[PDB]
Amino acid sequence: NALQNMDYKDYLKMSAGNVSEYPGSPEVFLSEQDAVKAAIDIVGKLLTGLGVPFVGPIVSLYTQLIDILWPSKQKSQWEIFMEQVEELINQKIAEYARNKALSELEGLGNNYQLYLTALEEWKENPNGSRALRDVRNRFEILDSLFTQYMPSFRVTNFEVPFLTVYTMAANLHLLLLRDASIFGEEWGLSTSTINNYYNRQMKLTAEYSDHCVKWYETGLAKLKGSSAKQWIDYNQFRREMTLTVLDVVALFSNYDTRTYPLATTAQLTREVYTDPLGAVDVPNIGSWYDKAPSFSEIEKAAIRPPHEFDYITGLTVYTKKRSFTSDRYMRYWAGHQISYKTIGTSSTFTQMYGTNQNLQSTSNFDFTNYDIYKTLSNDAVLLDIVYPGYTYTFFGMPETEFFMVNQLNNTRKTLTYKPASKDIIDRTRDSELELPPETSGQPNYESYSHRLGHITFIYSSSTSTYVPVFSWTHRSADLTNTVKSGEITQIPGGKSSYIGRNTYIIKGRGYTGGDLLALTDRIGSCEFQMIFPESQRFRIRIRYASNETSYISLYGLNQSGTLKFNQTYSNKNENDLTYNDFKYIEYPRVISVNASSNIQRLSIGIQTNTNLFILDRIEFIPVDETYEAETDLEAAKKAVNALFTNTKDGLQPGVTDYEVNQAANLVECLSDDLYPNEKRLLFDAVREAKRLSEARNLLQDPDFQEINGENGWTASTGIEVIEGDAVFKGRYLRLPGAREIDTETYPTYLYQKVEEGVLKPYTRYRLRGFVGSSQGLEIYTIRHQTNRIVKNVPDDLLPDVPPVNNDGRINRCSEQKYVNSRLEVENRSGEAHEFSIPIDTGELDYNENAGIWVGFKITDPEGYATLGNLELVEEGPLSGDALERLQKEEQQWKIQMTRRREETDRRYMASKQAVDRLYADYQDQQLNPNVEITDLTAAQDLIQSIPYVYNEMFPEIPGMNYTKFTELTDRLQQAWGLYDQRNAIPNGDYRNELSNWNTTSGVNVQQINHTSVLVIPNWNEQVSQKFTVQPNQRYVLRVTARKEGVGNGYVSIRDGGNQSETLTFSASDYDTNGMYDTQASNTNGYNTNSVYNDQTGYITKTVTFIPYTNQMWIEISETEGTFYIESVELIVDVE
């Protein structure tokens, strides 16, 4: 059969069996095919050697690339790359520029051959000075040839037709530079020489990428049109230029050996589309597209909008029949339902295409667990001629064969769609002409480059258009998101799973191998589902873009936490991102996963405040067993060193007491097993740092051991000292809210004076502290001016879940790590935990001894504060502007003080003279005989009139005259003290309320003008007392009282015999002789009266008395009205 037509030549094709007239149609026929076949091989080889830094695998990779780009076949592969695009866009590169480029490329080839042999020489003899010369020389020659020639491949006017050439050359150039950064130290390159190369490499990665994408996009735009025919051409360029340009560009980022120091697996997740399945260019008949929908109707119908990566599980095809007569008919694919899913879910999706009406039959296909690596389709036409001689044509698809390989057990199978048709015209279409397998030894079911992903459909009943369209995913994109232990695994954002939420996916431009995931204010979270078949430690890295600075949170893999991201770009749409708009962030927590055959989940979400985060890919980086420990050491070595000056024997003044404590906490993280000596030395250092903090701190009692002690903190009742609690190391203060009792509100306060003795002139100091959380906390600094700030600090450093778990003891290591990550978010407007307030001295004065007051207060009953690490430190001498403004405040001050010392010295000397008058000596141990209660109240009223006894804005703190006030009050009380000892009547001035007095129930003592006054409010009401006296001694009784209203007030004294005396008070005591109108004679003859109303007006009356018994009674009463008694006094008469 086959053999009887065969020619001897065909038969001598060892295995000669009728595919030796197209023996690799995608290998060596049309130049678009051979370009595509070569690009698919190249991409396929590069994927196996990403990250790999060893000389052996790199030599064999070059061996392979060189055999593809510079074969010894009679046509140049570079020429084929030009033809490919020249044909697609129908423009030829001008003769001279085309020939120049081909020359230079042939020459590049000769130089690569010599690089490869030198590289091989060096592998065999790595320390031979000849081999080192050779490999270095040949590298330097290639680099400068690339630099010379790259402009040759982007000649302006011809950027698009050159694009494949440009791409493949740029790729070699980036690989070349990569070699420098891995082999450079061994070739003898300087550190700086290597750095220059690496910097050039990263600049060039951006230039070449941005050029490739720009011009892909421009080329594609110029094939836009309005007809179906033009759509085919537009899509061809999309497909071919993805395979030949964008797939290569997407690898460029992985050639960075600093970011990728070991083997890395990349995944191309973009979909590509094979040409639509309808017949074209049928002799004397035409094409499916002759009568078809418009360009934009096909773009809409055939091409899926961006979506989460998916794979096909099932298909139901709907078949119709078409006849013009009964002799001849086509049954064809009229529409379909396709079932598919995302990774890891179990949720089946279904979509419907085309029509399902007026059907002949239905065909079902199950593809669960299989990849489809190849399709054979029939593009058929039905042609019929009917009376009276008119031709009718129908284009449709009556047959496909799906070639399948099992994902798990690797067996092969074929499923066929083939309804009965009769007398139709057929051409077969093989998917491998467009998407060939990789060139290995291996069969296509092992080496396929793409699998069938989805099936769309171009449908119009008007034009009888019924055309399936197949999309395809690259092999490098797995269906399980498996993460292996010996490599960096990349998982692009498109490979997230559907869990029921909408998801915003942006169209990628080629840079990333696929589409981009975006999180927004509308859709805040995504989930990934992954298989981890081995137990391993990893760290996570994320490749991202954003136009803001905010943070993400990560949940899953037995942990959760937060990560800051920094703005990467500004003033662009998210569709105009270029290479340099993408950066990396690294999560600083090592993840432990246990090996499991089931899915493990990681969810990523942004905060309430955040608008946009664009996720390109997440990366798993394997780490060994000591990585966590090594990085903890590095963190601690840094934080401790930052405490000290260069000589290591002092604190920098910008370093806070809180920071000393933070560094100490991080030292705790160190492993005793790995770093005992390093840990001991860092402990030694922080201990010394803490002692240094206490030495420079000008506050007494910074650890709060002696509250209300001498020359330390003065504190209101209720303030608590806490030790052994979260956030603060050692001891801190909790200030409660102000206390309400009935009408009165009693504030919480804490203050201390720093004395003049420890200060310096013309110097700046800083009050610093840490607030855990607060509301209504007032902080005061006082030297000459008083300054006040209010802090309201949020309670954002404690967690809402246990920070320890079972082990309920505090762990200062994990506590500080958590607190550090919270101080890392950006709110410094009065709500920062730290505070630092400046206080400036001018001249010093040991007499004034003004010092510096620091004060804290809460007036709000609902306020509070936790407060620690308090310090007052010297910053340094004032100079420049700060000094001038101080000399101004100071001079403004000295003027104020001069006025105020004058107000003081008068009120003072007046007060002091009143008190001087109370005594009959200069020692103050003897009272005058003649002093009465009224001399005491007068002194007291004047003492009360001394001003500036208290600070105006903080009255609990002493003012300039506190000392003067206190001295006179002590002296006044001493004298009042003597008065009561002298007074033979116990409690005669009612300073002990009503003790010693027998009273009826309505008698009370009231505070009138800061003095005790006995009140008798009604006439049924009485007071008396029996007390002892010396018989036959002359006493004098002195009564100071005010009688108001009708009637008389009486004070009666008697002995136990026949002696008694009665003093009478009445409102007649005030009535006045009267002006009697200026004694009826005064200038001109005008009138003036006197005043009978003397309200705040007591009268003193006296009477002498001799008791002839050792007992006496006093009795106080009234007939009516109200009687007020300031003092009853019974003293021995001096005469």
Q: Is residue 471 part of a domain?
A: yes
Domain identity same for 437 and 547: no
Domains in the chain, number: 7
SS3 label, residue 625: coil
Query: Domain end: 623, 645, 664, which one?
Result: 623
Domain identity same for 88 and 232: yes
Instruction: Specify the amino acid at residue 83.
Output: E
DSSP state for residue 919 in the 8-state scheme: B
Largest separation between any pair of C-alpha atoms in the chain: 172
Distance between CA atoms of residues 848 and 960, nearest Å: 8
Handedness of CA 420, 422, 424, 429 (dihedral sign): positive
CA dihedral angle for residue 876, residue 882, residue 888, residue 892, rounded to 10 degrees: -70
Distance between CA atoms of residues 188 and 210, nearest Å: 33
Q: Is residue 709 part of a domain?
A: no
How many DSSP H helices and E strands does the chain contain? 21, 46
Query: Domain end: 623, 639, 664, which one?
Result: 623
CATH of the domain at 733: 2.60.120.260
Three-state secondary structure string covering 458-486: EEECCCCEEEEEEEEEECCCCCCCECCCC
Structure token pair of residue 734? 């909790």
Label residues 870-883 b or e (16+ Cβ within 10 Å = b): bbbbeeeebeeeee
Domain identity same for 249 and 352: no
Domain identity same for 293 and 415: yes
Structure token pair of residue 402? 């799906």
Query: Domain end: 477, 503, 538, which one?
Result: 477
Domain identity same for 1008 and 1056: yes
Q: Is residue 861 part of a domain?
A: yes
Cβ partners under 8 Å of residue 262, min gap 6:
51, 52, 53, 487, 488
Label residues 1090-1100 b or e (16+ Cβ within 10 Å = b): eeeeeeeebbe
Q: Is residue 768 part of a domain?
A: yes
CA 470 to chain centroid, in Å, comes to 44
Distance between CA atoms of residues 506 and 574, nearest Å: 8
With residues binned 3-state (H G I as helix, E B as strand, rest as coil), the percentages for the chain, rounded to 5, are 30, 30, 40
Q: Is residue 1 part of a domain?
A: no
Phi, psi for residue 116 in degrees, rounded to 5: -65, -40
Of 1066, 1124, 1118, nearest to 933 by C-alpha is: 1124
Q: Is residue 509 part of a domain?
A: yes
Q: Is residue 871 part of a domain?
A: yes
* Alpha carbon separation from 676 to 71, 669, 672, 680, 730 (Å, rounded): 61, 12, 5, 6, 24
Domain identity same for 26 and 153: yes
Q: Enter the resolution in angstroms.
A: 2.3
Distance between CA atoms of residues 575 and 581, nearest Å: 11
Domain identity same for 277 and 254: no
Distance between CA atoms of residues 36 and 437, nearest Å: 11
Domain identity same for 794 and 864: yes
CATH of the domain at 278: 2.100.10.10
Domain identity same for 683 and 742: no
Of 604, 607, 608, nearest to 517 by C-alpha is: 604
Domain identity same for 873 and 894: no
Containing domain of residue 930, as a range? Answer: 887-982
Domain identity same for 690 and 636: yes
Of 790, 905, 761, 812, nearest to 859 by C-alpha is: 790
SS3 label, residue 615: strand
Phi, psi for residue 44 in degrees, rounded to 5: -65, -35
SS3 label, residue 1054: strand
Region of residue 1080 (phi > 0: left; psi between -120 and 50: alpha; otherwise: beta) = left
Domain identity same for 145 and 192: yes
Angle at 865 between CA 860 and CA 866, to 5 degrees: 165
Is 1121 within 8 Å of 1047 (Cβ atoms)? yes
Cβ of 23: how many Cβ atoms within 10 Å?
11
Label residues 944-981 b or e (16+ Cβ within 10 Å = b): eebebbbbeebeebbbbbeebbeebbebbeebbebbee
Q: Is residue 794 part of a domain?
A: yes
Cβ of 752: how many Cβ atoms within 10 Å?
21
